[PDB]
A paper describes a structure:
[name] exporters and importers share a core structural design composed of at least two intracellular nucleotide-binding domains ([name]) and two transmembrane domains (TMDs) embedded in the lipid bilayer that form the translocation pore, and the same mechanism of ATP binding and catalysis to energize the movement of substrates across the membrane. Later, our laboratory and others demonstrated that Gram-positive bacteria have orphan [name] that are able to energize multiple [name] type I sugar importers. Finally, we solve the crystal structure of the [name] multitask [name] [name] K43A; the crystals diffracted up to 1.67 Å resolution and based on comparative analysis we hypothesize about sequence and structural features involved in the broader specificity of [name]. [name] K43A shares the fold of well-studied [name] of [name] type I importers.
K43 is involved in ATP coordination and catalysis, interacting with the β- and γ-phosphate groups. Its replacement by an alanine resulted in 80% decreased [name] activity, impairing the normal function of [name] to energize the AraNPQ transporter in [name]. The crystal structure was solved at 1.67 Å resolution and the final electron density map allowed to model a detailed refined structure, which comprises all residues of [name] K43A, except the N-terminus methionine. Interestingly, most crystal structures of [name] from [name] transporters show a dimer in the asymmetric unit, promoted either by the C-terminal domains or the presence of ATP (or analogs). This is not the case for [name] [name], that crystallized as a monomer with one molecule in the asymmetric unit, and very few contacts with symmetry related molecules, as indicated by analyzing the protein interface using PISA server. [name] N-terminal domain presents the general α/β-type [name] domain fold, which comprises the RecA-like domain (residues 2–87 and 155–235, in blue) and the α-helical domain (residues 88–154, in yellow). The regulatory C-terminal domain (residues 236–365, in red) forms a mixed barrel with 3 α-helices and 11 β-strands. In the ligand-free [name] K43A structure here reported, the A-loop length is similar to the one in ATP-bound MalK, already in a conformation that favours nucleotide binding. The MalK F81-Y87 region accommodates the MalF/G helix, providing an hydrophobic environment; in [name], the corresponding phenylalanine (F82) is flipped, causing the side chains of Q83 and N84 to point towards the complex interface, which decreases the hydrophobic character of the cleft. Furthermore, in the hydrophobic pocket involved at the interface with the MalF/G, MalK A73 is at 3 Å from the MalF helix, while in [name] this residue is replaced by K74, which affects considerably the electrostatic potential, the volume and the hydrophobicity of the corresponding pocket.
Author numbering: 2 to 367
């Protein structure tokens, strides 16, 4: 289904809204992740969508029908993780069928939908077992079949991995991804975990304090963050940020001076940033081990002291600074590199971003 949120607001007791002008158009088959820190308003928004909470202002549409006034049960939404407990004395089959039985659906049609769900969950050999005979990993899949047999237009998932242990969490995460690949049901998934957002979504809605910060594919949000908060929240280790003073062709950070690409320089000039203090952002992977990288970087190298060098698989995380401004670089593993040495690094200024010092909003050079 297509969903439209048109200028939605939620207010409680205080006159600052908990959700502020939430505007979004979700296409069919998208897996949309709402992500942000504590109090971002994602979970409230999801419950407004479910119809557990009332919309204060604006319109919510499902397939172009305004459903603000429609009761939860009539919205054709499945709250996938609600009433999730299994009946211990019923089979897998019966735990998945239960809601259809209550609905008096004919037995054969029940059978057809149940078997189909079991195949999608990988439970076809287990249909006549009891829950106790399934492992923990298999057992947590069963109640998803209740959502699939419902034949709903949209699935809602509110932070379903948050209370699971590590081993069950990895398996649920994977199950959710598969369920989206096999059924393609339009889904809204709320989390506080930016890695889940990057790896599970078709598109992400980054939220803070009830306000949409950015909407985009995971790659778009990562590569072109709207502001400094998004740049710092998405990615781990997240973007490095520096204060410097822009001149004609150079950004001077502490006692370093990095050449700014002409293309970017032109726009910054035209927007009137020459001679002003600006925030410069650059990802760890875009700070290169200058020795090794095949590319030549034109006057954007510095000598950095290695505070710590941490091997992580085939990469090294380097913790350093430009004067008093800390940064992390993420380079390919090499052996000489040791905590305490010096290392020349080259900033890829084609991947650098500039943000306004007062607004923290990214300055569109693209």
């Amino acid at each position: 289904a297509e969903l439209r949120m048109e200028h939605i607001y939620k207010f409680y007791d205080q006159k600052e809204p908990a959700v502020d002008d939430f505007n979004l158009h979700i296409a069919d088959k998208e897996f949309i992740v709402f992500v942000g820190p504590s109090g971002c308003g994602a979970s409230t928004t999801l419950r407004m969508v479910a119809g557990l909470e009332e919309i204060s202002k604006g319109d919510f549409y499902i397939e172009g029908k305004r459903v603000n006034d429609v009761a939860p049960k009539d919205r054709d939404i499945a709250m996938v993780f609600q009433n999730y407990a299994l009946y211990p004395h019923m089979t897998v089959y019966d735990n998945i069928a239960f809601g259809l039985k209550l609905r008096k659906m004919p037995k054969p049609e029940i059978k057809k939908r149940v078997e189909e769900a079991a195949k999608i969950l990988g439970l076809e050999e287990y249909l006549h077992r009891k829950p106790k005979a399934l492992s923990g990993g298999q057992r947590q899949r069963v109640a998803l079949g209740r959502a699939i047999v419902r034949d709903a237009k949209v699935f809602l998932m509110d932070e379903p991995l948050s209370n699971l242990d590590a081993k069950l969490r990895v398996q649920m995460r994977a199950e959710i991804i598969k369920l989206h690949q096999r059924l393609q049901t339009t889904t809204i998934y709320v989390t506080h975990d930016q890695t889940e957002a990057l790896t599970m979504a078709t598109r992400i809605v980054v939220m803070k304090d009830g306000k949409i910060q950015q909407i985009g594919t995971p790659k778009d949000v990562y590569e072109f963050p709207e502001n400094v908060f998004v740049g710092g929240f998405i990615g781990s280790p997240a973007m490095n940020f520096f204060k410097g003073k822009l001149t004609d062709g150079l950004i001077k950070i502490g006692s370093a001076a990095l050449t700014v690409p002409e293309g970017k320089m032109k726009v910054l000039r035209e927007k009137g940033y020459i001679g002003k203090e600006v925030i410069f952002g650059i990802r760890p992977e875009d700070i290169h081990d200058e020795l090794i990288v095949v590319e030549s970087y034109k006057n954007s190298s510095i000598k950095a002291k290695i505070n710590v060098a941490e091997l992580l698989g085939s990469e090294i995380m380097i913790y350093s600074q430009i004067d008093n401004q800390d940064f992390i670089a993420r380079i390919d593993a090499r052996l000489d590199i040791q905590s305490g040495d010096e290392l020349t690094v080259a900033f890829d200024m084609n991947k650098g971003h500039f943000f306004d010092s007062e607004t923290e909003v990214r300055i569109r050079l693209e």
